[PDB]
């Protein structure tokens, strides 16, 4: 029965994995039935025109589409039609709360809303980037993939991560019911390689309390 007990998965797998490698994959996170329900909720968001072009933290002159080709919407988890996405978010949060004080030196107190994202085939992807390069509070990226029948050799869409200090990169296929964690800072630059079929994923970013407070102070003072 999935999801697995959070305490053991967090302390005996996620924590040591994250501290050693900065990247952790949990396959078959919620099971087929729940994963399919999430897929249907995501496809209904897509079908009803909720997605908008993905955006960047800062922009000068470049079109966002020369950088990221996905379309997204932000989900709080309590919206009608998003109940199973809410269960996913609650399950991610459960894991993080069982990791309190054990993920590096971070104190994780909060997170973003969920970013439901679609790369609509057609070779769309995301150029090599860092999720939080300049201290905006994000310390852990958590992604759930929902692509049933994804054949990455044909459809592409691999997330390639270049973890600092390793002799090989980490290729993450966007597999159905796969959960991924990685450090959001400069230790993990990464690319979404071009996707040739419709590719869905849901991301939440967890905040380190002290860094996020400093970032909010900068925003609220116009700096």
């Amino acid at each position: 029965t999935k999801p697995l007990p959070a305490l053991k998965l967090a302390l005996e797998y996620i924590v040591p994995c994250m501290n050693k490698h900065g990247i952790c994959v949990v396959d078959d996170f919620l099971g087929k039935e729940t994963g399919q329900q999430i897929g249907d909720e995501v496809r209904a968001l897509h079908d009803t025109g909720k997605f908008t072009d993905g955006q960047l933290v800062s922009q000068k002159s470049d079109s966002s589409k020369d950088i990221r080709g996905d379309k997204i919407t932000w989900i709080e988890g309590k919206e009608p039609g998003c109940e199973t996405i809410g269960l996913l978010m609650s399950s991610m949060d459960d894991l993080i709360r069982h990791c309190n004080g054990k993920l590096g030196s971070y104190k994780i107190n909060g997170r973003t809303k969920a970013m439901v994202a679609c790369y609509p085939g057609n070779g769309t992807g995301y150029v090599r980037h860092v999720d939080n390069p300049n201290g905006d509070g994000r310390c852990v990226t958590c992604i759930y993939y929902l692509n049933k029948d994804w054949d990455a050799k044909v459809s592409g869409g691999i997330l390639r991560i270049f973890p600092e200090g390793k002799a090989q990169f980490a290729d993450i296929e966007p597999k159905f019911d796969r959960l991924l964690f990685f450090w959001s800072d400069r230790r993990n630059p990464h690319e979404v390689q071009p996707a040739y079929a419709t590719r869905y994923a849901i991301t939440v970013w967890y905040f380190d309390a002290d860094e996020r407070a400093r970032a909010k102070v900068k925003y609220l003072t116009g700096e």
Partner: peptide, 20 residues
């Protein structure tokens, strides 16, 4: 060196963080 914030995925700064 490139300003990496121009490649980084947007998040709301203003009133939209969730407390755990």
């Amino acid at each position: 060196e490139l300003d990496l914030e121009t490649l980084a995925p947007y998040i709301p700064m203003d009133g939209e963080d969730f407390q755990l």
